[PDB]
Amino acid sequence: RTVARDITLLECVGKGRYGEVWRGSWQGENVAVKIFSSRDEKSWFRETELYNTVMLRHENILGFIASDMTSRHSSTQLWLITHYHEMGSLYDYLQLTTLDTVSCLRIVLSIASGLAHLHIEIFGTQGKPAIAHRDLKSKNILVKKNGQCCIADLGLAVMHSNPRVGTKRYMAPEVLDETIQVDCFDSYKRVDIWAFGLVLWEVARRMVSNGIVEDYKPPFYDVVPNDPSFEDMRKVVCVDQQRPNIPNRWFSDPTLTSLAKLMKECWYQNPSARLTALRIKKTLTKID
């Protein structure tokens, strides 16, 4: 039989230190092709090892298609091929649109659903190890046409049944002050919950209430520079214990009032006090 492996690369939709992401076509279907830089080859190996261990399939997890290593003259080429989401990342989407109550809740519940799926160990033969993402942020969430999102980029993920770090802006206090209990898998889940709370804040700002909305801003936009240093973040999050500001106007809206409470419970200094992804999901299903 013929094994069709050609992928037509059509447009570059992202470029960074990690390499590039391309919209491509295989057998008439859109795919996304992440071409890894040499600097980020470990992310391809980690995501490939994870998917070789457990073939994750979930509506709120970016859908895997293939991992490819191709030998070249003096180098190795590494591609990750996934489903393609033409609306782009949540980071991109929130810059050009505001949200109503239903759309806001649908986004955040779908993220919580993908995150709880990663976090939970499932036993039996169609089960999965528990997984922590370790780089959750709005650029690593994609928006689907049906209004739900999916979580992307498991290049830093850890499974439970040289060392790298996530994006500094989204790092939890215990990462920045180096107290994280690196031998406890639950510690990594709690780092994800902190970052989820920041994403919740980014989304909520874009939900209209009483004719008011906030402009899109990244977490800590008002207290750290672009490309904040580790020390910049440590001073804000650990030393001064600052948290993203909740605007007054949210307290006139029942949804945003509830989401503010939820955020706060993701942002406790004590990691063990933070809500779990499953508890976040339940709370979200009862809002509105």
Ligand SMILES: COc1cc(-c2cncc(-c3ccc(N4CCNCC4)cc3)c2C)cc(OC)c1OC
């Ligand atoms: C090797 O590389 C690539 C292969 C393919 C691909 C293309 N067509 C057919 C297949 C296929 C799938 C299953 C089976 N079997 C199933 C169990 N019983 C026997 C039959 C045979 C063939 C595959 C995998 C696509 C790629 O990209 C998108 C690839 O590159 C990453």
Ligand SMILES: COc1cc(-c2cncc(-c3ccc(N4CCNCC4)cc3)c2C)cc(OC)c1OC
């Ligand atoms: C890698 O991605 C894609 C692969 C294929 C593809 C091509 N040829 C054969 C297969 C196949 C056929 C039979 C089995 N069997 C498994 C054991 N029990 C019996 C049944 C498995 C796999 C598949 C999935 C199609 C895609 O899209 C349409 C893909 O997505 C882009």
Ligand SMILES: COc1cc(-c2cncc(-c3ccc(N4CCNCC4)cc3)c2C)cc(OC)c1OC
């Ligand atoms: C975050 O990680 C990954 C994302 C994707 C991915 C999947 N579907 C769509 C996109 C996309 C498409 C268009 C835009 N727009 C940006 C503004 N101007 C117009 C164009 C943004 C994003 C991307 C990036 C693929 C991955 O691997 C293969 C990823 O890595 C695991």
Ligand SMILES: [N+]
């Ligand atoms: N790592």
